[PDB]
């Protein structure tokens, strides 16, 4: 039933920031922006946040992103007992991506399984699609990129 995504594959099969997918970039959200109130914390106890920058900024995302992320968290545990959803990257303030990255406004996450078993990433990407993320992309061997439309 669930066919894993192939490496470098994305779904839907169109560029990310286009209509049928995640839609267009709506501008960066810096801490000091009024847009900041669009972000909302995700405190899901069953999602691992890498939190590499130590700020917990990884947890701040749109309500839409949060909701897709949470459901994925539940199907991940369903697909593999012992394994959870993991986020390596979410809201980015340091421009570590392209121009107009959805990461810049809390509409994108980079995910893995909690066990970091790259063997799982293809199937994970698929679950993310099932979870209703609006664009899912097996970006690299080490993580999967998921994004959503704006509200
Ligand atoms: Zn990403």
Q: Are 102 and 147 in contact (CB under 8 A)?
A: yes
Nearest in space to 143 (alpha carbons), one of 67, 34, 48, 30:
48
Q: Are 89 and 110 in contact (CB under 8 A)?
A: yes
Ligand 1 centroid, distance to 82 Cα (angstroms):
25
Instruction: Quote the tokens at residue 71.
Output: 């459901």
Instruction: Quote the tokens at residue 32.
Output: 């000091």
- Method underlying the structure: X-ray
Residues 122-142 as b/e (b if ≥16 CB within 10 A, e otherwise) read: bbbbbbbbebebbbbbbbeee
Question: Which residues is 146 bridged to in the sheet?
Answer: 109, 136
Dihedral Cα 124, 17, 97, 90, nearest 10 deg: -50
Ligand 1 centroid, distance to 4 Cα (angstroms):
19
Q: Is 143 annotated as a binding residue?
A: no
CATH 3.40.50.300 fits 1-151, yes or no: no
Q: Is 52 annotated as a binding residue?
A: yes
Q: Are 73 and 44 in contact (CB under 8 A)?
A: yes
């Amino acid at each position: 039933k669930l066919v894993p995504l192939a490496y470098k594959q994305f779904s839907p099969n169109v560029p990310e920031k286009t209509l049928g997918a995640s839609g267009r970039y709506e501008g960066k959200i810096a801490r000091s922006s009024e847009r900041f109130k669009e972000l909302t914390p995700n405190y899901n106890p069953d999602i691992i946040f890498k939190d590499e920058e130590n700020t917990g900024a990884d947890r701040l995302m749109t309500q839409r992103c949060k909701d897709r992320l949470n459901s994925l968290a539940i199907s991940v545990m369903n697909q593999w007992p012992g394994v959870k959803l993991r986020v390596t990257e979410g809201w980015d303030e340091d421009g570590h991506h392209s121009e107009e990255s959805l990461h810049y406004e809390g509409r994108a996450v980079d995910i893995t399984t909690s066990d970091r078993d790259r063997n799982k990433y293809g199937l994970l990407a698929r679950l993310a699609v099932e979870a209703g993320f609006d664009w899912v992309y097996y970006e690299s061997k080490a993580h999967v990129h998921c994004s959503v439309k704006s509200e």
